[PDB]
Amino acid sequence: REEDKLWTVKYAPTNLQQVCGNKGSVMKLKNWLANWENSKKNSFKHAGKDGSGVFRAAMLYGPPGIGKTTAAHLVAQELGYDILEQNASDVRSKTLLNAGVKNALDNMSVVGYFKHQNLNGKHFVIIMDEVDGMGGVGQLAQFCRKTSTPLILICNERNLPKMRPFDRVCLDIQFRRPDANSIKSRLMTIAIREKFKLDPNVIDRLIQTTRGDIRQVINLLSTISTTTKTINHENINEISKAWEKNIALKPFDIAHKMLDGQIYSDIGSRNFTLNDKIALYFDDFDFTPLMIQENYLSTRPSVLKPGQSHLEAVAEAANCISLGDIVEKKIRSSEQLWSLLPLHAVLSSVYPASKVAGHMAGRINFTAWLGQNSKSAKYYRLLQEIHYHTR
Amino acid sequence: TLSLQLPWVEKYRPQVLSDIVGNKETIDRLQQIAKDGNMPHMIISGMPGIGKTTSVHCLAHELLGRSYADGVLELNASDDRGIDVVRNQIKHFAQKKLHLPPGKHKIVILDEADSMTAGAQQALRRTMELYSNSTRFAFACNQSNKIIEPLQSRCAILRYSKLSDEDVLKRLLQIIKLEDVKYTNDGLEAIIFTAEGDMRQAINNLQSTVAGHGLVNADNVFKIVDSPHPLIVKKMLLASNLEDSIQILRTDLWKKGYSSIDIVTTSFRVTKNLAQVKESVRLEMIKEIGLTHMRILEGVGTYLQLASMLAKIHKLNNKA
Amino acid sequence: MLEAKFEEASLFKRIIDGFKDCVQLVNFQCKEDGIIAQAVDDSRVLLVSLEIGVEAFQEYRCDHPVTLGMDLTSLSKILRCGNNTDTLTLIADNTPDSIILLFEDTKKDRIAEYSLKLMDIDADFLKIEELQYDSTLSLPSSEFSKIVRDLSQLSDSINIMITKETIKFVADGDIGSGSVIIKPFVDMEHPETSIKLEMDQPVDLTFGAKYLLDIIKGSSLSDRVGIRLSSEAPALFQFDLKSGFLQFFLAPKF
Amino acid sequence: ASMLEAKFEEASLFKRIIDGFKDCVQLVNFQCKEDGIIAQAVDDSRVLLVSLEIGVEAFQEYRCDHPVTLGMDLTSLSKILRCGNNTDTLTLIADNTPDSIILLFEDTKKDRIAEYSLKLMDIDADFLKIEELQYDSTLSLPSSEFSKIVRDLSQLSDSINIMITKETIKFVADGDIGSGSVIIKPFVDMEHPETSIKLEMDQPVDLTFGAKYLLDIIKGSSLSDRVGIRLSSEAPALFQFDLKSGFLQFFLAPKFN
Amino acid sequence: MLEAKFEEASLFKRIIDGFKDCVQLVNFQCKEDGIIAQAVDDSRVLLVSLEIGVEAFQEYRCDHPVTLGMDLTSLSKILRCGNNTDTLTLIADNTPDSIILLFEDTKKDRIAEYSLKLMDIDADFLKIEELQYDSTLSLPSSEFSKIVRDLSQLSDSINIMITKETIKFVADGDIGSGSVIIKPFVDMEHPETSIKLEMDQPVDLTFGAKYLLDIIKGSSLSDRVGIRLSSEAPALFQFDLKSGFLQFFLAPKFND
DNA sequence: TTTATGTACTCGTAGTGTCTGC
DNA sequence: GCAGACACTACGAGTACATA
Ligand SMILES: Nc1ncnc2c1ncn2[C@@H]1O[C@H](COP(=O)(O)OP(=O)(O)OP(O)(O)=S)[C@@H](O)[C@H]1O
Ligand SMILES: Nc1ncnc2c1ncn2[C@@H]1O[C@H](COP(=O)(O)OP(=O)(O)OP(O)(O)=S)[C@@H](O)[C@H]1O
Ligand SMILES: [Mg+2]
Ligand SMILES: [Mg+2]
User: Fold this and answer.
1) Which residues of chain C are within 8 Å of residue D176 when distances are taken between CB atoms?
2) Which residues line ligand 2 (CB under 6 A)?
3) How many helices (H) and strands (E) does chain D have?
């Protein structure tokens, strides 16, 4: 009914012409699922016009709340394919996955028999929504290799190593942050439908602060309209600050934000205090010390003190990096003093990057100490083998 | 052993949304949700003791009445909220068919939600997305960082802020007038200063002072409860004379019975939360405080180490 | 308003045991004629249709048509808590939020009254079909269960052949071959051992064994089972209960 | 020779008695006297109290002149009883205030002799004089019936509420799956005297108890054919299992509100 | 050249079950007189000797002396097909880098052939210095395993004090003490439970726990196990067999 | 991805026990 | 009654967090 259903549910898209942005990705998904049967008749021995003939499976990722689930549902329903979804609320263990949709990989829809012309309303389309909520990944990959039904997966972060086996077993379709025009039009329709006034310049800031999360934008509109139906440019900053989303940050972006010269400026420190720097370090405390060390010497410094050269700043940062090494060794030892993490945060990320801050000389490189250490460990093992053999 | 009187913290817990003071906009929005009935999924966050879970309980009581015995499932850290034995519980509760008023839904109070594992929240993602028509969730966590971003993408962010002194004073005066205890404005401002916007701390200090001396005058308040040592540490670190800093250290912390590690941790927290002095100066102050922290944790805890820490802090502060 | 009195809490436990392995949520739709249950598997591949005649109940009183969507695990647990000999009595009030099923003991006096919380099943109703089936073979349930458990150790693919007017079962596949042909077993002396086949067209349908075990698990209720095969429509595994019928719909594999 | 001698007719009796309350209690404080042997032990949560008592008639021979405080550990005690043939005749042996006791696992009646010893444990907690009081109700039902009811109801809720009013026993357990309401009408039978729902009445009682603790109680149902439950609003619940010569109570603490 | 055909499939498996925990691997040495495979544990303390006869275990045809070194885990994995009727077939050709283990069943026509990899060890020392033992004891192996596990559960150190008419087992631990004494009692009606301790000199030796567990693991090899004790000498735990015997050695650790 | 204890969670497995049955 | 079937508790290996 109305007035007793969530705004993000009653205003869900009804067709593929009601999706805000991601027109290319939805179009690609529609083409892939509209030509799977032709690829099946081709026995998957060659690609199609867009390359859909080689991949019997696809996977969707993107930021939350942008329309992956809605696009999947509408694409499955428009062609009549019967939806068969597995979710994180149910078990995806290897034994139960083999005891679950494994038989459904080539069966038929009995409800499709009873429901119904709907020529292709007689098949399963399989939906692992929330793949990241996991030997489940191995079983899913082996399903992707051998499946007699359309199959897609929905996750959020491909870059995680646990979906690494999905590297070339699925037709990747990437969803991005939608452009503000379609969301602007959708909120205009919603505002004129739900009696509350909305100001066009406000949608841009709402999308900017919400970081392209349409569902959270609808929730924000509902919550504001509960007591203050009028949205103007007066309380825009108040609402943006109250509903700001403290999203976690990726290691490369962590290194970029840490090495930016503005945050250590006098003006830039009023809002981005060093407490925010500690909180930013603590997002990924295992990669930030390694990321800072490998690119703190490949920038133009912009916070050089008068009479101080770039090399002096590099040396003074290396001193505190060496101190952070000793702090970490005390942290990860038999004593196991984990109350020392805030000190390691400063000495390993904040102070060394507070002297070499500036634009990149090249670009932020992935940490190489991990690979070098692994190769050194294997070389040590082989050295021990020959040492003991010849002894 | 006579039955104990209920403490004033729990005796005067609010039962309606009107009695909660502070964050007027959030309370008014909660009231509009209460009479409207269209409760969305929300996450409530803030510093401890400012009225997070009491607002959740009051809203759950107001939205649905006699159905409160079975129409709300409350969970907490004392319940073993895991991925496996508990997904079935919320799955059944959301799938449970109970007849409500037309504009009311079942409420799942996942109180203290920042302590759950990642997999539990991953299951809760689709659990919330599926039965959004029947059940609604209410997270109440001190820190919102532990909650994953898919959960934040489908929840209404209700951030509580620390209570202003006026609202704490107003509700305190209400409590005095209901209890009829002799009070002095200096004592009340002492309670406000000691509480630091933590309401339960204010009520507990009021209890201790009332039942310890009868009068809540400022001298009795400072006799019973001590001033917060973060303020003393901030005063000590910001002094200009080294002798003054050493005297403050000794008299106010070493002779008051404060462990050295507590002083070091409080100094680190004050320095990282301080903003008056230059950023770089705070960086070397943090480095030196951390060196003293390593010395303390390695075994040697002595007044001499704290004195050396203060001496080097003054060396950096006075610019050689 | 619903008052379904059973003579003993044995046949209800037996039917719940029979179909509880495959389906996990059912929806009892109670009417004046009796009770009708519609069940869909979690994989949406097999469908269990159950209806019970009013004569099975010792007493059945109803006022309005009311639905009851339950959970098989909780219901089976509550039923197993009660004694087998007792007399079950399903009671539903004006609001179908919970049912009151209670066990009465003739010996002694122990009214182990239980309550079960209902669940909100989706809006999908029953859309039962009447399309013609080409094959209707009806053979003893026990020996059918025995032979299909014998064939279940082979591959999952279980295809049924209607060649040569003779029931021809094949359980071949990747891991091995399980082709075993059975003969009609009509006997004049024993009416319980009789096989009749329509033989309209030798249609070919294949199925899965891991579910077929769940179909054959309900063989205890009826000694007579009849596979009704169609050229296109899904297979039927009907069990003629003493009053109603309990039939399994299985979608053909492909 | 030794001051304390207690030769059981069979090791099976002591094994069963120990396994009756082995799970719910960690530390046991035996107090041997000339009248018999008693054992008052408290659970770790200090909610469930066990008061074992074995009369002198359950021993084939028994002699203990001086009172002995045998504080022990049930885990190691059960481990010691785990090894040894069950048909063998156990003989408890202890010295004058010793550091240990000696378990004579005399195989059959000759040949093999065992000398298993368990170091005595210093439990300074005195025995608690919680014997009985004016109980509001006194019911008596077969152990099998009570065990079956508790096992059935524990799957439905975490708390079992026992209500007695006007010659009727009623167990209710409201939870998430459902709410059991098992009720019992008192009766007596001359044909089978073992099954008889005896009852007494002073004032109605509505006392709730935990599920795990009640399961721990019914684990001991194998010792006695009958179990006697006595309830009061101002007293812990009493579960008197009758033994061959003594008894084994279970003082369970009800929940409030 | 090697044709060590074994009568029962689940017999050599039964032997390697005992061989698994005593030592990680053995170096087989097949001779027409018999099969010997002795290995040294990782501690160089526990000694295992193997002897297999020729009259039983089907016809044994060892044309040439063959020395083979291989693991027991893969051997057990191949021997997992241990049906009560199945047999064994050992074939070693020139350069036997991969022994083919043929399975032929009498009850069914199904056949199974697998190849076992060979590692390069070529190390085997066979020395039996002592045969004279002060006390020789025969007793049922199941009772030995029972008493050893009961005493080793209580304590980590096991000592034996052999005196006149008493075979004393004592185990002192922190939890308590277990002093089980068994007397030599022989029943002619029950040969398996017969106990005889030959008496020349009393033996008092202190042993370990894990070694005793490894010794008693192979309890099913013989109904009666031969236990030999010598003063100031390694112990000898000889397990009998239908053709040959398996003896286990251990150093009596003692620090007083 | 190394880190190097202690904690907590999760799953899987192996038996161990009582419960139905012929 | 012995045999199978059954679901239960107990145990072991693996992963991930560690300051706000
Ligand atoms: N492009 C869009 N246009 C309009 N509404 C949208 C769009 N994307 C999302 N929504 C709204 O957001 C709701 C939920 O979107 P979903 O597709 O379920 O989010 P999601 O892509 O699954 O992200 P996850 O699963 O939470 S990580 C829909 O029901 C719509 O109301
Ligand atoms: N705004 C308020 N108005 C009135 N009483 C309040 C208010 N905030 C807190 N209290 C009192 O604080 C006590 C309980 O506060 P809670 O809401 O339970 O603390 P909290 O907000 O949950 O913080 P944490 O994280 O749970 S420790 C009661 O005695 C309330 O009366
Ligand atoms: Mg989704
Ligand atoms: Mg709270």
Assistant:
1) 117
2) B 9, 12-14, 19-22, 48-54, 142, 171, 199-200, 203
3) 4, 18
- 3-class SS string, chain C: CEEEECCCCCHHHHHHHHHCCCCCEEEEEECCCEEEEEEECCCCCEEEEEEEECCCCCEEECCCCEEEEEEHHHHHHHHHHCCCCCEEEEEECCCCCEEEEEEECCCCCCCEEEEEECECCCCCCCCCCCCCCCEEEEEEHHHHHHHHHHHCCCCCEEEEECHHHCCEEECCCCCCCCCEECCCCCCCCCCCCCCECCCCCCCEEEEEHHHHHHHHHHHHCCCEEEEEECCCCCEEEEEECCCCEEEEEECCEC
Q: Give the structural domain span for B256.
A: 228-320
**Residue D152, CB, strand G, below 7 Å:** no
Specify the amino acid at residue A164: R
Residue of B nearest to C94 (CA): B99
For residue C57, what are the CA distances in angstroms to B265, C3, C36?
Answer: 75, 10, 13
**Separation between Cα atoms, residue A77 and residue B105, nearest integer Å:** 29
Elucidation technique: cryo-EM
Query: Could you give the angle at the alpha carbon of D119 between the alpha carbons of D115 and D125, nearest 5°?
Result: 140
Cβ–Cβ below 8 Å for C120 and B99 = no
B87-101: burial string, b at 16+ Cβ within 10 Å, e else: beebbbbbbbbbeee
CB-CB neighbours of A388 under 10 Å: 8
Last residue of a domain, one of B227, B251, B268: B227
Determine the Cα–Cα distance for residues E66 and E118; give it in Å rounded to an integer. Answer: 13
Please enumerate in sequence order all residues whose Cβ is within 8 A of that of B90, keeping only pairs 6 or more positions apart, or say none.
B73, B108, B124, B127
Query: Which residues 64-83 in chain B have a CB closer than 7 A to strand G?
Result: none
Q: Which of B227, B250, B268 is the last residue of a domain?
A: B227
**Same domain for B120 and B4?**
yes
> How many structural domains does chain B have?
3
E124 within 8 A of E27, measured Cβ to Cβ? yes
CB atoms near residue B149 (< 10 Å): 17
Q: What is the resolution of this structure in A?
A: 3.4
Domain ranges of chain D: 1-257
Mutate which of B147, B153, B154 for ligand 1 pocket (most atoms within 8 A of beta carbon): B153
Q: How far apart are CA A282 and CA B146, in angstroms?
A: 12
Length of chain A: 391
| Gap between the Cα atoms of C210 and C152, Å rounded | 8
- To the question of whether residue B90 is assigned a binding role by annotation, the answer is no
Shared domain check, B153 and B22: yes
Residue A80 to residues A101, A115, A124, B269, E244, Cα–Cα distance (Å): 20, 11, 10, 60, 75
Is the CB of residue D180 less than 8 Å away from at least one CB of chain C? Answer: yes
